[PDB]
C-alpha cells in the first residue's frame, strides 16, 4: 500500500499575502489547535499506510492535516484567510467523512472543531 503525496506547501508562482487575518490564524488558531491534547491525529497527513487503512485515500480525496496548514501558514502560502479556513474545514469534513459517530477521532475533530469556531468568530476585520 501507498500513501499519496501530501498537499502543496510551496508553489512560487501562486500569488500570497501576509494578512493580519491570516496572523491570527497562525498566531491564534492555529496554535491553540496545535497544543490541544487531541490534536495528535491531525498534526500530519494520514498515513494510510502505518494505520492499515488502505480505502482512506479512495474515501477521502482531498486530504488536508494541520501540519500542512501549519506550513502553508508560516510560508506564507495563502492570499487570504479564507482559504486557510477552507482547509481547517476540509481537515474535520475528512474525518467525518471517513469515521463513524462517535468514534475517538470524531470526538477529538469535534473538539477541535468546537475551539476552531470560537476563535475564527473574533477573526479580526482586515486591516
Ligand atoms: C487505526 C484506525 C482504524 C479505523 N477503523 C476502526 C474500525 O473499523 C476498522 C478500522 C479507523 C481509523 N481512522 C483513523 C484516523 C487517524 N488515526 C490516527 C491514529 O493514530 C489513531 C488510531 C486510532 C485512534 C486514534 Cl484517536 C488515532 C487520524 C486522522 N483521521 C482518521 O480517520 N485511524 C483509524
Known amino acids: 500500500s501507498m500513501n499519496p503525496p501530501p498537499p502543496e506547501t ?10 493580519n487575518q491570516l496572523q491570527y490564524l497562525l498566531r491564534v488558531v492555529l496554535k491553540t489547535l496545535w497544543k490541544h491534547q487531541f490534536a495528535w491525529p491531525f498534526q500530519q497527513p ?8 488502505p480505502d482512506y485515500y479512495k474515501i477521502i480525496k482531498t486530504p488536508m492535516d494541520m501540519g500542512t496548514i501549519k506550513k502553508r501558514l508560516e510560508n506564507n502560502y495563502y492570499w487570504n ?16 467523512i471517513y469515521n463513524k459517530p462517535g468514534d475517538d477521532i470524531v470526538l ?20
Open 81 to 96: 484567510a479564507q482559504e486557510c479556513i477552507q482547509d481547517f474545514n476540509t481537515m474535520f469534513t475528512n474525518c467525518y
Open 46 to 53: 494520514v498515513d494510510a499506510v502505518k494505520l492499515n487503512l
Open 10 to 19: 510551496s508553489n512560487p508562482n501562486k500569488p500570497k499575502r501576509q494578512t
Open 108 to 127: 477529538m475533530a469535534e473538539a477541535l472543531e468546537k475551539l476552531f469556531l470560537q476563535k475564527i468568530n473574533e477573526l479580526p476585520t482586515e486591516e
